[PDB]
From Swiss-Prot, chains A, B:
This is Parathion hydrolase. One of its GO terms (biological process) is catabolic process. It is found in: Cell membrane. Binds 2 Zn(2+) ions per subunit. Has attracted interest because of its potential use in the detoxification of chemical waste and warfare agents and its ability to degrade agricultural pesticides such as parathion. Homodimer. The gene is opd. CDD domains: PTE.
Amino acid sequence: DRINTVRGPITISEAGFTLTHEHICGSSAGFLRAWPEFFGSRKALAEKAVRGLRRARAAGVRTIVDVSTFDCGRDVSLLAEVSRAADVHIVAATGLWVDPPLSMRLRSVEELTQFFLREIQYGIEDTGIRAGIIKVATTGKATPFQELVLKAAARASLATGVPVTTHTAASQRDGEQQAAIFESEGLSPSRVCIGHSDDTDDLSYLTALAARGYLIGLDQIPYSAIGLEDNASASVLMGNRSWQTRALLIKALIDQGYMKQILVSNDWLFGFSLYVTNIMDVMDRVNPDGMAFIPLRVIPFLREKGVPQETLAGITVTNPARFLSPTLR
Amino acid sequence: DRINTVRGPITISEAGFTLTHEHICGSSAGFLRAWPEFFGSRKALAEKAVRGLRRARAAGVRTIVDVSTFDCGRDVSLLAEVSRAADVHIVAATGLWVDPPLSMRLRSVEELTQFFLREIQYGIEDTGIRAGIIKVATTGKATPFQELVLKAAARASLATGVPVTTHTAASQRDGEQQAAIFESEGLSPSRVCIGHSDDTDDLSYLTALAARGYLIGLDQIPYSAIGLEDNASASVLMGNRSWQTRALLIKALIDQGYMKQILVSNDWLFGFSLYVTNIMDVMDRVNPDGMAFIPLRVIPFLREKGVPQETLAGITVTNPARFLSPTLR
Ligand SMILES: [Co+2]
Ligand SMILES: [Co+2]
Ligand SMILES: [Co+2]
Ligand SMILES: [Co+2]
């Protein structure tokens, strides 16, 4: 029926063209509040985000999913503010990313489940803003704590119908262990997106997941450190393949007959404190289109390579709606 | 000649009997706001904290220094709220503890100096509340990042006259390396307290630092896991020496001529998310006096051993006043 946004519950039909993996600000918990000058200021960060969202909107984007968790420095009232100013829906996330603090690392699976459910059914902090997605992450084989997080995510999903989205190291085929763990919890693959899947050339790894009912997150399309290979921080972050190479996996998955299982995005941000301090400037130099990269560059590129209009709109409208709309299957 | 508190600057006289290493809540950045139900509720924690402070105040305490940092879950507005309600002065801290998030770990010594100076000179978050102390931490030999934190603290202190206080593993003799770094930065030992120094009975270690002019933090006096031996968390946290063993070190340093270098405290808290879930309950079971433990139990203990009121007054009033009052020397 309805989807939780930072401005309240909306009908599925209001989502329209959705980017399913983005960030307003990728930071750490409390870091934006304690040190806004890292980002110019809170106001300059907010203005920059509103500019970016209005540009993506002019290009046809109606909704983004901010998959920043607690430990990724999600600041939900910032998300609320830029949503209202830009008139772009924003779905906020719960879950845990790859930098949980000690107060999280020491929690049991039952405690974590209570936490994730809190931010979905009760709200995030004291904002009354409720998460419409759960974000989790592994980086290679899951640590014992990550195993907890994945189970807690599956359980929160199973109690609410809110889907799970993942950060992976696709090159190490993380999606296979993630999926094995999600299924052990009785979670339906149709409530799970295996993200960062565009970082691999292995089309078999992808179609198998797709054939199992999972969604495939081809969500870092503009990421490439070509031309700046000596920037270590950009190189680890963006890798060494072209955006066209990343974008061509969309076509490949379509040609295998799995367009229904594809979600595309930019994984873009407007502030970034988690690498070298000017990583955001370096990324903006790589992709001046920001979040409008998908509608402005990827969509025409794919149409030029022969992909039908109906298909590109199914991937950017139908699939996100079917993914976000609350269900157990 | 004034000390910053959460309710504004106070005179030296107003500080009175001061506990120099305490916590309202030991947690992680943003944890209390994201998950207050871990602590019953923010209201239940506040009320416990307020009752706690009123009790300490009835026992003679006028001021506490909350040495919770950003990454130790400092919530300065909670500190401001409980300070007003109980009419106990609270000095807030800057610095970093042992759990810095990625957004902190990637920062340079120059950036860390900037952030610490922000919190001292500009204010904590958007509160306008200024830190009156810098807290740093090592656990054995400093990591590459902890070296940067220590250097940045020395520099911040050097620019403001605001003192530095440390978390140590006393058994690893951390004070010796902390001192060497601090001195290499040209920071006066009179502006530094080497904390958690009561965890060891190594007097040659303590008197060497005390001889250099360092203040010695005997700050976990009520910590003892005697009785609850099989409690995993309580033993690691509190060790196996009785409180009277910890307290005797105070008398030890007095008798070796160092009463002016001694600062005493409980290292007590009213919420704690950094160990097993019910750690606060267990600790309250050990020390039902809370922050009143120092004035109600430790002070009379020393008095019975023949330590004059004049000497006790100097340790609990004069010493904290000389320590907190801004100076480079
Ligand atoms: Co990611
Ligand atoms: Co992301
Ligand atoms: Co400590
Ligand atoms: Co402490």
